[PDB]
C-alpha cells in the first residue's frame, strides 16, 4: 500500500541513459532493471535505482537474467555508499505488459517485502504523467480464485525530494513563474475528452468483443461516481450560483474599478507631467 513515492528525476535520467544503452548495444528492446528505495512509510523515495543486464525471449516472457554479482554483490558495494535506498522493486518498459512481470516481482519479493514493478516510459508523449508504480496485490475476485498478482495501480507522483536544481533549473532555459490558465484549460478539457473517447471505444468493445470484465468490479460504480450528477437540474445550485455570481461580480466590479482609478490617477499624473512640463 503506497499512495506516493519520491519520483526523483535523477533516477529518471538513469533510466533514460540506460534505455539509450539498451538501444545502442543492440536490439534488446524492453528496458528492465531494479528499482531501489527506502521505505520511510506508505510514502517512499525513488532517487536511486539501476538497470540489470537482462534479456526476454520473444516467446515465454518468463525469461530473465538477474546476475547476483551485478545485484547482490553490487548491493554490498552500494551498502557501504548508502544503505537507505534499499532494494525496493524493479521496472519494465513497453506500454501494457508482458507475462513475466509477476514472476519477476515475486522472485525479487524476497529482497523487498513490498517489491514494485514500474511500466517505464521511454518516449514522453503522454497527456499527463509518466511511469507509475505497481506493488504486490491480492485482488483475485468475488470468485476469489487462486490469488492473482497482477500488480494494481499503486498510485504515486513525481516527488522532488530535494531541489538540487542548481543544475536542473540551469537546464530548463525555457520557462518563467507563469503568473497559463488557458494552457491548463485546454489541457484539462482535451484530456478529459480523449479519456472519455478511450472510454466509449472500450465500452463499445465490451458490448462487441469485450470480456467478462465488461462490467468487472467498478465500471458500474464508475458510472455511479458519474451518477454523482446523473440536465442534472442544478436549480438549487442555479440560484446558489446566482448569489455566487452576485459575489463574483461584486468582486469584479469593486476590485476592477479600483484598478481603473489606480492606473488612472498616477499614470495620468506622469503623462501630463512629461507632456506639458517638457515643453
Amino acid at each position: 500500500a503506497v499512495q506516493k513515492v519520491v519520483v526523483h528525476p535523477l533516477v529518471l535520467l538513469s533510466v533514460v541513459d540506460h534505455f539509450n544503452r539498451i538501444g545502442k548495444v543492440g536490439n534488446q528492446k524492453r528496458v528492465v532493471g531494479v528499482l531501489l528505495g527506502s521505505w520511510q512509510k506508505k510514502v517512499l523515495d525513488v532517487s536511486n535505482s539501476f538497470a540489470v543486464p537482462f534479456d526476454e525471449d520473444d516467446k515465454d516472457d518468463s525469461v530473465w537474467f538477474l546476475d547476483h554479482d551485478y545485484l547482490e554483490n553490487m548491493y554490498g558495494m552500494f551498502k557501504k555508499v548508502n544503505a537507505r535506498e534499499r532494494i525496493v522493486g524493479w521496472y519494465h518498459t513497453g506500454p501494457k505488459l508482458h507475462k513475466n512481470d509477476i514472476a519477476i516481482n515475486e522472485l525479487m519479493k524476497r529482497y523487498c517485502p513490498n517489491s514494485v514493478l514500474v511500466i517505464i516510459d521511454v518516449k514522453p508523449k503522454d497527456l499527463g504523467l509518466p511511469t507509475e508504480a505497481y506493488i504486490s496485490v491480492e485482488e483475485v475476485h468475488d470468485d476469489g480464485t487462486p490469488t492473482s498478482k497482477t500488480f494494481e495501480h499503486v498510485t504515486s507522483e513525481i516527488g522532488a525530494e530535494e531541489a538540487e536544481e542548481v543544475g536542473v533549473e540551469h537546464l530548463l532555459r525555457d520557462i518563467k513563474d507563469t503568473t497559463s490558465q488557458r494552457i491548463t484549460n485546454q489541457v484539462h478539457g482535451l484530456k478529459g475528452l480523449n479519456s472519455k473517447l478511450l472510454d466509449i471505444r472500450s465500452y463499445l468493445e465490451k458490448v462487441a468483443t469485450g470480456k467478462l470484465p465488461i462490467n468487472h468490479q467498478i465500471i458500474y460504480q464508475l458510472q455511479d461516481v458519474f451518477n454523482l450528477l446523473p440536465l442534472q437540474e442544478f436549480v438549487k445550485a442555479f440560484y446558489l450560483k446566482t448569489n455566487d455570481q452576485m459575489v463574483v461580480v461584486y468582486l469584479a466590479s469593486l476590485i476592477r474599478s479600483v484598478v481603473a482609478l489606480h492606473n488612472l490617477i498616477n499614470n495620468k499624473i506622469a503623462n501630463r507631467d512629461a507632456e506639458k512640463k517638457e515643453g
Binding site: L254, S257, K268, R272
Partner: protein, 189 residues
C-alpha cells in the same frame, strides 16, 4: 455644547436654562438613541439643571420609549415654542416633521405586519393625518417602507448591504470617473 463643565454662567450665557433650550433643540436630532442616552440620560450634569425645564425633558424621556401620543402633544408644544423663538422664524419648518418621520422610522422598524391605525391611537386620530403626512413624506423621498389604506401596511426594509452599499460604488466611481475624464480630456483636448 457637549462641554457642560465650562458654560455654567457667563456674560455670554444669557441664561443657562436657555443654554439648555438651545442644546436640546439640537440634541433631540444630533443625538441618535445611543448619543441621546449618552448626553441627556448618562450626562446627568445637564440633568441637575434641566431639572428646571421638565416639559422637553419628559419629551426626551418618551423619545426613548417612543411614546408617540405625548410625542405629538409636546410636538405641538415645541412647534409653537419655536414659532415664538429667536433665530428660527424663517426656518423652523422642518424640525418637527423631521421628528415625525424619524420616529415613524423606528416605529415601523419594530416589525412589518402592522397598521397605522394601531398607531393612529398613538397618532391621536391619525389615519387621515398621517395619510396625507406620510404620502407627502414618501413624496419627500423619505423612509423606505410600505403602508396602505385598504390594507394599512407597515414595513421593515431598506438594507444598505442589499444594493445601495454596492450602488454607491458606481455612484461615485462614475461621478469622479467622468470628473477626472473630462479633467483629463482638456489636458490634451
Amino acid at each position: 455644547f457637549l462641554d457642560t463643565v465650562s458654560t455654567f454662567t457667563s456674560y455670554e450665557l444669557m441664561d443657562y436654562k436657555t443654554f439648555v433650550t438651545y442644546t436640546v433643540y439640537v440634541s433631540m436630532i444630533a443625538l441618535e438613541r445611543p448619543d441621546l442616552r449618552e448626553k441627556v440620560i448618562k450626562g446627568a450634569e445637564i440633568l441637575e439643571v434641566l431639572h428646571s425645564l421638565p416639559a422637553v425633558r419628559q419629551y426626551l424621556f418618551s423619545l426613548y420609549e417612543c411614546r408617540y401620543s405625548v410625542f405629538f402633544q409636546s410636538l405641538a408644544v415645541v412647534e409653537q415654542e419655536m414659532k415664538k423663538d429667536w433665530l428660527f422664524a424663517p426656518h423652523y419648518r422642518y424640525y418637527v416633521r423631521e421628528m415625525r418621520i424619524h420616529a415613524y422610522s423606528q416605529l415601523l422598524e419594530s416589525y412589518r405586519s402592522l397598521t397605522l391605525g394601531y398607531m393612529a391611537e398613538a397618532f391621536g386620530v391619525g389615519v387621515e393625518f398621517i395619510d396625507q403626512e406620510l404620502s407627502r413624506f414618501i413624496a419627500a423621498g423619505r423612509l423606505h417602507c410600505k403602508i396602505d389604506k385598504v390594507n394599512e401596511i407597515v414595513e421593515t426594509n431598506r438594507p444598505d448591504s442589499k444594493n445601495w452599499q454596492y450602488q454607491e460604488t458606481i455612484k461615485k466611481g462614475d461621478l469622479l470617473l467622468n470628473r477626472v475624464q473630462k479633467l483629463s480630456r482638456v489636458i490634451n483636448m
